[PDB]
Here is the input.
Amino acid sequence: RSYPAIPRIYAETTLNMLLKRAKKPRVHSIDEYLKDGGYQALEKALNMSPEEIIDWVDKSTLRGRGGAGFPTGKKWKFAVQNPGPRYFICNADEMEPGTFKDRIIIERDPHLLIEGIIISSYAIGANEAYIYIRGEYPAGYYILRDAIEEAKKKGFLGKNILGSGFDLEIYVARGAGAYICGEETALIESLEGKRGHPRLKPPYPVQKGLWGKPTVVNNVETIANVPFIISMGWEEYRYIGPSDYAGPKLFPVSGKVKKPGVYELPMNTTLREVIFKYAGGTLGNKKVKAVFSGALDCFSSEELDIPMDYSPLGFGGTGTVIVLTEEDDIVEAALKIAEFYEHETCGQCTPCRVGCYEQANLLEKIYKGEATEQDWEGFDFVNRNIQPTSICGLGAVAGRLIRQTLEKFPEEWEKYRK
Amino acid sequence: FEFPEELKTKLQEHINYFPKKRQAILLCLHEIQNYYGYIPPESLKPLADMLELPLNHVEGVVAFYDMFDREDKAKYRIRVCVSIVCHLMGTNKLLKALENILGIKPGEVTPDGKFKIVPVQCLGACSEAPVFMVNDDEYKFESEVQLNEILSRYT
Ligand SMILES: NC(=O)C1=CN([C@@H]2O[C@H](COP(=O)(O)OP(=O)(O)OC[C@H]3O[C@@H](n4cnc5c(N)ncnc54)[C@H](O)[C@@H]3O)[C@@H](O)[C@H]2O)C=CC1
Ligand SMILES: Cc1cc2nc3c(=O)[nH]c(=O)nc-3n(C[C@H](O)[C@H](O)[C@H](O)COP(=O)(O)O)c2cc1C
Ligand code: SF4
Ligand code: FES
Ligand code: NA
Ligand code: NA
Here is the structure.
C-alpha cells in the first residue's frame, strides 16, 4: 500500500549484509526477501535446539548495537536460567541525536528484523514478542504491521510455525515522544500502559521485565544480525571485522560531511576512515574540530585514529558520528546537548530532574553572555552533580559530553567566561 | 461526550490488539489526536472506561508524552527538529521560511487552524538535516520555494 513520506537517507555497505537490500531506499516486501534466501535461517534455526542457537549467538561475539555493547548471547543465557513465560522485546525507540541507523532496517528490509525476532524469541522460549517503535516513525510502524501480516500469510508467525510446535505473535507498540522510553525498563513500563519511568536495576529485565517475567530487550540492529549468525554459522560470522568485535556495524554519519548517511562497515574501521574514506571528508574540506557520539561522547581531532568497536579505547556507543568543523561553536553545540537532556529527564531522581534543567538554563545564560560569576560556578557544579542517586543511564551521562567539551576545548569556553 | 462510531471502532481494534487492554493506551491517544487534531480533555473519561483504567492514570499518561497536545486543535502539525544536527545544518532557515509562508513561529497555529509549528527533538533523519514532518510525512528542508511546494499539498 501507500506509506508516509520518508527522506531518502544515503546508505553504503562494504559487507552487503544488513544493507544488502536496505542500501536501496524503498520497502522490500516478503517476495524480494524470499528471493534473496530470506527465512531460510529461521527454517535452519527451528531444526536446532534453543540452547544451540544461544551458543552460536554467544560464540558470534555479537554485542548490543543499542549502544552499551552488552554481549547478546550472555544476556539470553541470563533470561533462560529464570522460569517462564519469557518475553522478547525489539527496542525500535531510536531517539539519540544523530542516530538513524535502525530506521533504514525497519523501513527498507523489515523481514530481516522480523526473521531476527522470530529466531531470538525461539532461542529464549518467548511465545510473545514486541516491537516498541518511537511515535515519530509512523511509516516504520505501518511498514512493520504490513510486513508482520506478510510473515503470518507465509506461516513464519502464528501457532506451530512450520510444524516446529513453536508459537509466536509479534505486537507493534508506538512511543509518543519520550526519549526515556528507549531505556529498557521505561520501555517495559510504556508497554504496560504507564508513563516511561525507568525501574531500579537490578533486577535487570532478564530476571524481572514485562509483567515481572524474564524479558530480553534487544536493539533493532542487534536482532538484524541473528539471521546472518544462523545462516553463516558463528565461525564464518567471526571472519567479519576483528574476531573480538565481529560482524557488520551501521554507522549513521551526519553534520559537516560530503556524504551524510548510514555506512555498513567492520568495527576495525577507524573514525578517520568513516569520515574521510567513506563519508567523503568534510564540507569545504574544513578541519574536523569534534565528533559528537550522539549525546554521549565528544571526541577531538586528536582522537580520530580510534577503532569503531566496543573496546575500552574504541568509539563504542551507537556508532553515531556527528562531525563539527573548525568554524562550529563548541559552546553553541553543548547548549543543544543540554537542551536535549532538559527536555527528556523523567524527573523521578532529584539531581537528574534539577540538574538537566539547571545545566540547560545556565548554559543558555553563558551562551547569551547574560551569566553572572555565580551562574558560571553554578553551571560547573550542576554539570558534575546530575549523576548522583540516578536509577538510569540518562542521569548517569547528562553531563558527560559537555564535561568533555570543557576539558578538550577550554580556550573556546574561556572566550565565553569573559 | 461520546466517540463517533468510526473512531470508537478503531479504538476497540487497538484495545483488542494487545493481550491486555491497558497496553493500547498510546495507540488510542494517537488515534484520538488523529481524529480531532488534538486530545479533547472530555475524550479522556470515556477512553479510561474503555481501557478499564482510572481517569488520573490516563490524564498522567497524556501529560507525560510530548506528541499529545490538549491545548491547540491543528489539521496539520509541522514538527521542526531543533536538536544539534538540524541546528548545525539550518533549523533557523527552515523556521524563517515557515514564518515567511504561514506567518507563524514555533508553538503558534495559523488563524484558520490549519498549521501548528511544533519544535521537536531529533527526528532520527539527521543526514537529511534540517528535518521536518507534516503530520506523518517527513522531509528535508532545501529552500523556501521547495517548502512552499510541499505545504501546497496539504489542503
Ligand atoms: N539507540 C538510541 O537511540 C539510544 C541509545 N542509547 C544508548 O544506551 C546506552 C546505555 O544503555 P543501558 O541500558 O543504560 O546500559 P547498560 O550497560 O546498563 O545495559 C546494557 C544491556 O545489558 C543488560 N545488562 C547489563 N548488566 C547486566 C547484568 N548484570 N545482568 C543482566 N543483564 C545485564 C541490560 O539489561 C541492558 O539490556 C548508552 O551507551 C547509549 O549509547 C541511549 C539513548 C538512545
Ligand atoms: C535514556 C536511555 C535511552 C535509550 N534508548 C534506546 C533506544 O532508543 N534504543 C535502544 O536500542 N536502546 C536504547 N537504550 C539502551 C537500552 O536500555 C538497552 O541497553 C538496549 O535496548 C539493549 O539492547 P542491545 O543489548 O541489543 O543494545 C537507552 C538507554 C537509556 C539510558
Ligand atoms: S536518571 Fe533521570 S531519566 Fe533516569 S530515572 Fe532518574 S530522573 Fe528519570
Ligand atoms: S538532529 Fe534533527 S533529525 Fe536528528
Ligand atoms: Na516491492
Ligand atoms: Na528509511
